[PDB]
Curated annotation (Swiss-Prot), chains A, D:
Belongs to the LysR transcriptional regulatory family. One of its GO terms (cellular component) is cytosol. Homotetramer. Dimer of dimers related by a twofold axis. Residues 2-59 form the HTH lysR-type domain. Sensitive to oxygen. GO terms for molecular function: DNA binding; DNA-binding transcription factor activity. The keyword Transcription regulation applies. This is HTH-type transcriptional regulator TsaR. The gene is tsaR. Regulates expression of the tsaMBCD1 operon and of tsaT in response to p-toluenesulfonate (TSA). Acts by binding directly to the promoter region. Binding to the tsa promoter depends on TSA concentration. SUPFAM superfamilies: Periplasmic binding protein-like II (SSF53850), Winged helix' DNA-binding domain (SSF46785). Toluene-4-sulfonate binds at residues 99, 101. Residues 19-38 bind DNA.
Curated annotation (Swiss-Prot), chains B, C:
This is HTH-type transcriptional regulator TsaR. Toluene-4-sulfonate binds at residues 70, 72. Belongs to the LysR transcriptional regulatory family. The gene is tsaR. InterPro entries: HTH-type_LysR_regulators, LysR_subst-bd, Tscrpt_reg_HTH_LysR, WH-like_DNA-bd_sf, WH_DNA-bd_sf. Sensitive to oxygen. Pfam families: HTH_1 (PF00126), LysR_substrate (PF03466). Keywords: DNA-binding, Plasmid, Transcription, Transcription regulation.
Amino acid sequence: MLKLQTLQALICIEEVGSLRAAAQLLHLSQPALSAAIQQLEDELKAPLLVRTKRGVSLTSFGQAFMKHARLIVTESRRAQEEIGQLRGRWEGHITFAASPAIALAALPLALASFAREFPDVTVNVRDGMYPAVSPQLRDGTLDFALTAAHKHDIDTDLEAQPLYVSDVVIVGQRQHPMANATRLAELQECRWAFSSAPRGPGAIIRNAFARYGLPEPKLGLVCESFLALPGVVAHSDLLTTMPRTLYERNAFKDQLCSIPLQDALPNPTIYVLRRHDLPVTPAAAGLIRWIQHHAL
Amino acid sequence: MLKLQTLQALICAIQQLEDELKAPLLVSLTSFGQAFMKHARLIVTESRRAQEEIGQLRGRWEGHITFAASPAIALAALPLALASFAREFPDVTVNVRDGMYPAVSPQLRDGTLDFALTAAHKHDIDTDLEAQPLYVSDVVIVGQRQHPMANATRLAELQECRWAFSSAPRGPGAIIRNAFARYGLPEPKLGLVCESFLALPGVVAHSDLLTTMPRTLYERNAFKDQLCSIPLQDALPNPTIYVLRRHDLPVTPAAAGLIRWIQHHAL
Amino acid sequence: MLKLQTLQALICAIQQLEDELKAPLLVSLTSFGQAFMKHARLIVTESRRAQEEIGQLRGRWEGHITFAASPAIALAALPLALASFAREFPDVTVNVRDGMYPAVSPQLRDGTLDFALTAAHKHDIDTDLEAQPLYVSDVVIVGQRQHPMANATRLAELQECRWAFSSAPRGPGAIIRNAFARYGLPEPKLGLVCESFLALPGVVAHSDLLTTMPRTLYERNAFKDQLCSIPLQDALPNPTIYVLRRHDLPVTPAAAGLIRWIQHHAL
Amino acid sequence: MLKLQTLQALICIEEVGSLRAAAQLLHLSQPALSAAIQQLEDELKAPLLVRTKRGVSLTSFGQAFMKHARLIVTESRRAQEEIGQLRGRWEGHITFAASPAIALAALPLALASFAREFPDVTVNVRDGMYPAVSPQLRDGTLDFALTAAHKHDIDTDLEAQPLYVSDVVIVGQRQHPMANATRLAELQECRWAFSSAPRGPGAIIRNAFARYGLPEPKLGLVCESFLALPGVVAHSDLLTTMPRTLYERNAFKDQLCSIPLQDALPNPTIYVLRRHDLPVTPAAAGLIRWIQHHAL
Ligand SMILES: Cc1ccc(S(=O)(=O)O)cc1
Ligand SMILES: Cc1ccc(S(=O)(=O)O)cc1
Ligand SMILES: Cc1ccc(S(=O)(=O)O)cc1
Ligand SMILES: Cc1ccc(S(=O)(=O)O)cc1
Ligand SMILES: Cc1ccc(S(=O)(=O)O)cc1
Ligand SMILES: Cc1ccc(S(=O)(=O)O)cc1
Ligand SMILES: Cc1ccc(S(=O)(=O)O)cc1
Ligand SMILES: Cc1ccc(S(=O)(=O)O)cc1
Ligand SMILES: Cc1ccc(S(=O)(=O)O)cc1
Ligand SMILES: Cc1ccc(S(=O)(=O)O)cc1
Ligand SMILES: Cc1ccc(S(=O)(=O)O)cc1
Ligand SMILES: Cc1ccc(S(=O)(=O)O)cc1
Ligand SMILES: Cc1ccc(S(=O)(=O)O)cc1
Ligand SMILES: Cc1ccc(S(=O)(=O)O)cc1
Ligand SMILES: Cc1ccc(S(=O)(=O)O)cc1
Ligand SMILES: Cc1ccc(S(=O)(=O)O)cc1
Ligand SMILES: Cc1ccc(S(=O)(=O)O)cc1
Ligand SMILES: Cc1ccc(S(=O)(=O)O)cc1
Ligand SMILES: Cc1ccc(S(=O)(=O)O)cc1
Ligand SMILES: Cc1ccc(S(=O)(=O)O)cc1
Ligand SMILES: Cc1ccc(S(=O)(=O)O)cc1
Ligand SMILES: Cc1ccc(S(=O)(=O)O)cc1
Ligand SMILES: [Cl-]
Ligand SMILES: [Cl-]
Ligand SMILES: [Cl-]
Ligand SMILES: [Cl-]
Ligand SMILES: [Cl-]
Ligand SMILES: [Cl-]
């Protein structure tokens, strides 16, 4: 029998006056309790109980022992209570960062399903991209981050699981002079709104121009805000690069076109990043599952 | 004495700087290095603004402007102001980012931002910052188009709802929390916290969570047809959007030009 | 339910404990593991005391006593009390360490110490602890034997001196700081801080630093001939040394025996 | 010329009305200042100064430039001031741990000499031994620790420099029955006061008994306090092991003897331990030097 059950039973025995009554009250087997008490007495090398006409009383030894037994039972209960309070607070909240692509399609659908499964959980969704999320992830504030990244850039102490392989698209105002272009070379005369990338503003288009043997793309402006980007492009002759999800889901869709080139652009891999050592709550694990699920 | 050329490298020789300070700056930045960095940023950015301004006074309109914009600004006036600015000043490099008060303050103080366009409570604004009113905005309560409370007209009717606490100068959910409080209601029941304005409309469209947002954002997002605004007849705040700057920094001619175009289109 | 055998291993199977708690305990202890440890220590130490006490009630005088002793105790009464105790109780294992209030408190609370012998201010003593007066001590001011102020008779004459702030229940230098304050003097000028009573006499003997120490320590150290006590006629405190225990823990027969010998020799 | 000197000079020029007067006031060479200003003007592509009958005035351009120059000069001064405040507080205090051997001989002599060289420095000497000092050393609270250690036990991220090779001695009451012993084997019947060691209470004597092919030494008691140890031994028949310095320097010398065996005991190496990456203040470096000096 578990020692704690045996101590709890002993406290009950003192209270109700009988080993048989204690076992029944606590839903323990009588023979198992009687054996467990005997085993404990053999270990202590003294009897804890003496028979009387109508039950058992504690012996002098059991009296002394009981003072400790009560402290041990209370302490076990308090420990369970403190841990429950601390685990409840840990398990009851999620803080993570999400990139625009996740934020715009999967995240909305994932949160509703997540909430049905984990009704008692608060979510704190931050705007975030690597490597800005790297240090927030590193101290413990962020439970995980969801972002495009180049696998070989990710800090060695971070775990990384592929979430979805994304699309990027070149976007301009709906009547842009270069809308019919099929080659990146045909865009050399255009000016660019450099957008946010893990490798810095304009990293994608600059890398594209480079691998195609073109000069540096002409900087029109730097727009780190994906929120602002579609509107800014819609009201200019600037071209930009954005996640396909943002092109599909923005307030200026009717004022914009994509320029589908026969030249290839990257398909950024979006990763779930966590600190490797950290243990993961049920809810955080469930949310990731739900986000995975809706990232078809 | 400090060598100013070395500062623009620290942000990116060091031993001479460490010897000038007589303290370690690198080990990652030491505790001294972090304290040192805010100063080095102001010195470097001021030095660049000084040179750019002189070129502008000579008719060479080149240089840099870096600024932050809160969501309503970014969606309405900003595309039009950036377009007009680019026509008048074709050779100035502009860098726009998202930002909200008070998160923008340290970046106004170290000169990394020329200005920020953001809602703020006037009495909360730090004394070293100037605040020029730009816009008086409108806030609405938003839910999925078929929300159970889509036809509610009083805050009281929304008591049992869960909220996507949205971001604000006084913290997430501050407008709804204060509104609930002023109207004699208990704390708004939180469903989740959503800092991201980009993500918020879609999160609300695919849940039963209510939120508060600038009327601009309600009228300009990708989920408009899946959303509604609650037809409240209880009054909500109208936040003032300001142009915020560190007051003692002289505005460059180019940044003054952009602020002017922003003021024009906001009006 | 917890398995008590596993607790005595955690201090030194785990997955069953982690599953019982439903929280990670190891990763180094997790934040839960640290919170868990104080409880596990009390449970394990109480379990051992319970068994030892029963053997003692049966005339088997074996078991363990672990206690802390402040410097004056350790030097005067303790050698004589441990000797007398060992004669009466030859088979009990005793473990003595240095310790002072309030540093000893958590170790009284988690059962790792049966008791502590230490100076304390009665009104500072935490409500779950019992305090039994043991000794009223004497404090002296000490300096190198040829100190410029060796013949000073008033605290006022020591104003310009530098102090080896020595350790105390209210913090380093607390007795001299409070004495200076009560006598209407400025803060004592600190020369250095010396936590170590073992090192203090030798540090004072080979510098011009004054300190305060228990009269016992002054009369019992290896640097006596190189030291003096300042013949002050201003009054200094006489700290009470207590036997401190966590009150709700039943004292074992063996520990009661040792406390008795300690009380005898202190008297 | 340093740009900051040039800006400071420019501010002075505005104030005193003349480049010549500014150079003299600031103790700068006139030709060097005139060249530095010209160089700056060439870089700005505008003149900062215009000649008048009795000096120079700022041009319109210099006026605009001066507003920035003043902010830059002030900021440089404030930076120096903040760093000075932070460095002064860093350099003005030392916190370290010291073991009994150090604490009893070298430390006393080292502190006086240290104080003459670094009068403006507060020292905070903690009682300490490895590996208890290991974590205090690890977070930043301790600047260094001075302790016996086994080289191969020391945490890999800690630097360790040998300070002194120590002696340990077996000690008993002055008339101990085994005082004339010459072999460890002759002490097998004795009971021991287990003393503090880096490897745990009684580690040294237990290791000694072991390498000599003897049984476990008989435990009399555990005395973790080196302060209490000499007195406890003096009033018993217990034997112990202690640093030679403690045997030489304690209040019970007349009541104690050492038992100099022909069998060898260890000579623990005392190390200065620091975190490897951490930069070291002049004072802490000086104190270590002084402690090294007095550890002959
Ligand atoms: C065990 C026990 C003790 C005493 C009695 S009595 O004789 O009936 O009082 C009966 C049974
Ligand atoms: C079974 C049982 C045992 C003892 C008694 S009594 O002697 O009347 O208390 C009654 C009934
Ligand atoms: C008569 C009687 C039988 C059995 C017990 S018991 O051992 O406490 O369960 C008490 C009294
Ligand atoms: C450049 C870039 C930015 C963001 C993303 S996203 O993580 O798929 O939204 C992909 C690529
Ligand atoms: C960045 C990004 C956004 C959207 C998509 S898509 O889901 O493949 O259309 C891919 C990548
Ligand atoms: C921006 C970006 C991120 C990631 C990749 S990927 O390495 O092909 O997954 C390519 C481009
Ligand atoms: C609550 C709130 C958040 C943000 C704005 S905004 O500055 O107009 O985008 C106004 C009001
Ligand atoms: C100088 C200037 C630039 C741009 C415009 S705009 O065409 O109205 O945007 C008007 C005037
Ligand atoms: C400091 C300060 C000034 C003003 C206000 S307010 O009146 O609530 O906006 C609050 C706090
Ligand atoms: C620029 C701008 C910001 C905010 C609004 S409003 O909130 O819809 O009134 C309108 C226009
Ligand atoms: C995180 C989260 C997502 C969705 C909801 S709910 O749609 O209001 O039930 C609540 C909480
Ligand atoms: C200040 C002070 C420190 C320590 C003691 S003791 O507890 O008597 O050793 C008494 C007084
Ligand atoms: C029981 C007992 C033990 C020891 C002594 S003693 O010789 O006075 O220390 C007296 C009495
Ligand atoms: C709580 C408390 C009780 C008593 C004192 S005392 O009177 O200064 O010793 C101080 C503080
Ligand atoms: C045990 C003991 C402690 C303290 C003193 S006294 O401080 O010298 O009076 C004497 C004896
Ligand atoms: C650290 C330190 C400070 C002061 C002195 S003293 O000059 O001998 O008083 C010695 C040692
Ligand atoms: C440079 C300079 C400017 C003006 C005069 S003035 O003609 O004597 O006033 C002399 C010299
Ligand atoms: C050298 C010198 C230059 C100019 C004058 S002034 O014309 O009288 O001001 C006097 C002397
Ligand atoms: C007459 C005169 C000569 C030189 C200068 S200076 O160039 O400002 O030093 C000012 C005035
Ligand atoms: C066991 C032991 C403890 C302490 C020292 S000491 O560092 O030389 O004092 C050496 C050996
Ligand atoms: C631990 C310790 C203390 C003292 C000495 S001694 O300096 O070599 O005598 C060595 C070692
Ligand atoms: C306790 C102790 C510490 C260190 C050494 S040593 O490894 O030989 O320096 C031996 C024994
Ligand atoms: Cl039995
Ligand atoms: Cl607000
Ligand atoms: Cl203008
Ligand atoms: Cl005190
Ligand atoms: Cl007793
Ligand atoms: Cl020029």
